Amino acid sequence: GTENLYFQSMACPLEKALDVMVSTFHKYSGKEGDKFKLNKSELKELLTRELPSFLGKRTDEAAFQKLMSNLDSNRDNEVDFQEYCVFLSCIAMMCNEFFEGFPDKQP
Amino acid sequence: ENLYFQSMACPLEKALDVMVSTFHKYSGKEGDKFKLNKSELKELLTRELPSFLGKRTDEAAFQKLMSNLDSNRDNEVDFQEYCVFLSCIAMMCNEFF
Ligand SMILES: *CC(=O)N1C[C@@H](c2ccccc2)C[C@@H]1C(=O)Nc1cccc2ccccc12
Ligand SMILES: [Ca+2]
Ligand SMILES: [Ca+2]
Ligand SMILES: [Ca+2]
Ligand SMILES: [Ca+2]
């Protein structure tokens, strides 16, 4: 980084959130095989680099195939965009329930 | 008096946080504080998702949207039904990709 970097505020961050959801999928889904689906190696790379806060530092290797079968609803061994949206929606519902129930919880 | 900023090493995680916090920025204004009524839903759409609104901004347009999103027919949009809405938008955006 030897030149200035310029940044602009976002008027509608929820719209940019949607753009990031779409682009992150294709960042990995186009690495091998079908360019519009995620295979196990691409999904594992996505979660590890893009969603580490949700992985609980678990790297056993057996764990991923359980999630992959969960996400693979049409059972074609890959995750398409619609199944990826079900996944993200599910993560977001979990975060929302943590927020909504927080004042009632204790460690 | 200090202001603080951070870079976002994992922007997909922040996008998820924006999805959650945007919901609650509008759902607590009226009535049930964890669901969007028609008024709250209209405000969220116009302010947070203006690129997906369209010229159709009549009250019949928002009432049809409310009806398409309110799956359990309680005249509110809860967080799950809001997620279905957002996934539909994502899937549209992806088609044009
Ligand atoms: C939305 C949801 O239920 N889940 C998201 C998933 C996740 C794991 C790591 C990083 C980001 C998201 C965990 C969870 C899930 O889908 N669990 C699923 C259902 C039951 C059992 C089970 C067992 C082992 C692996 C996954 C699994
Ligand atoms: Ca692929
Ligand atoms: Ca699949
Ligand atoms: Ca409300
Ligand atoms: Ca409802």
Swiss-Prot record, chain A:
Residues the record lists as N-acetylalanine modifications: 11
Tissue expression from the record: Ubiquitously expressed.
List of residues binding Ca(2+) 2: 72, 74, 76, 78, 83
One Gene Ontology CC term in the entry: extracellular region
Gene Ontology MF annotations: actin binding; calcium ion binding; calcium-dependent protein binding; chemoattractant activity; identical protein binding; RAGE receptor binding; RNA binding; transition metal ion binding
Compartments, record wording: Secreted; Nucleus; Cytoplasm
Residues of the signal peptide: none
Protein name (record): Protein S100-A4
Source organism of this protein record: Homo sapiens
Native organism taxonomy: Eukaryota, Metazoa, Chordata, Craniata, Vertebrata
UniProtKB/Swiss-Prot annotation, chain B:
GO biological process: epithelial to mesenchymal transition; positive regulation of canonical NF-kappaB signal transduction
Binding annotation for Ca(2+) 2: 70, 72, 74, 76, 81
Primary localisation category: secreted
Domain EF-hand: from-to ranges: 19-54, 57-92
Gene3D superfamilies hit by this protein: EF-hand
Positions carrying N6-acetyllysine: 14, 42
GO cellular component, one term: nucleus
UniProt keyword annotation of Repeat present: yes
Pfam families recorded: S_100
Stated role: Calcium-binding protein that plays a role in various cellular processes including motility, angiogenesis, cell differentiation, apoptosis, and autophagy. Increases cell motility and invasiveness by interacting with non-muscle myosin heavy chain (NMMHC) IIA/MYH9. Mechanistically, promotes filament depolymerization and increases the amount of soluble myosin-IIA, resulting in the formation of stable protrusions facilitating chemotaxis. Also modulates the pro-apoptotic function of TP53 by binding to its C-terminal transactivation domain within the nucleus and reducing its protein levels.
Subunit details: Homodimer. Interacts with PPFIBP1 in a calcium-dependent mode. Interacts with PGLYRP1; this complex acts as a chemoattractant that promotes lymphocyte movement. Interacts with MYH9; this interaction increases cell motility. Interacts with Annexin 2/ANXA2. Interacts with TP53; this interaction promotes TP53 degradation. Interacts with CCR5. Interacts with FCGR3A; this interaction inhibits PKC-dependent phosphorylation of FCGR3A.
Name listed for the protein in its UniProt record: Protein S100-A4
Organism: Homo sapiens
Name of the gene: S100A4
